Symmetry: C3
Subunit: 91 residues, 3 copies
């Protein structure tokens, strides 16, 4: 990402150097700079996609967190019942 | 992602063919390949942006999970007091 | 993202204009359009990376939720014991 902004920085310069005084070799140099920048972009996209695997892992944990919560609240519902039966048993 | 890497390697190859034997038609070739590669990069980003909606959906679910937990803990706090009174009352 | 598609479409048209009748000036203009498109792509990548920090914050929140649940279930395990002992006693 820091590589990207710099790589884009270099790329704007080569463009500027190309704009002020064209040349065929300067053109090919620009295209080479573009390819290298695109290469870094693809690497940034790859890393993002890899990092996004956590999204799936987070979603699975939430689901299990919710499943455990539902079980707790059914128990609490049954536990609330037991106490009322207990109190009324006493009086 | 796989399309990206191949599309980038196609792109690197054309650059090579351009570097070894420069030409105007080969320059336009290169630029067309770049535009094609950029087009695939954009689709990759759009798909990533689409997938990122799960982040929001995950965040909403965690919040609801925490809200349900706080409720359970409040109930448990009251339940614990009920048993203290029940036991103390009996003994 | 809306900028990207337009930026790419502008780029596609310049290519066509370049393909209509090649020219150095047209070549240089195309390379600039690519640079501008790449510049928008990087900004898009930055925005995604910034947005991705929510993934970490979600993960931390899930962990704290799970930790809180485990505490509840240990308590519930103890509370179920109390009622059993209470009922049997009485
Ligand atoms: Ca709970
Ligand atoms: Cl997430």
């Amino acid at each position: 990402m820091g590589d990207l902004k710099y790589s884009l920085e270099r790329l704007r310069e080569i463009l500027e150097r190309l704009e002020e005084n064209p040349s065929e070799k300067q053109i090919v140099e620009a295209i080479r700079a573009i390819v290298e920048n695109n290469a870094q972009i693809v690497e940034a996209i790859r890393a993002i996609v890899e990092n996004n695997a956590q999204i799936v892992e987070n979603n699975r944990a939430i689901i299990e967190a919710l499943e455990a919560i539902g079980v707790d609240q059914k128990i609490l519902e049954e536990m609330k019942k037991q106490l009322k039966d207990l109190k009324r048993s006493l009086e």
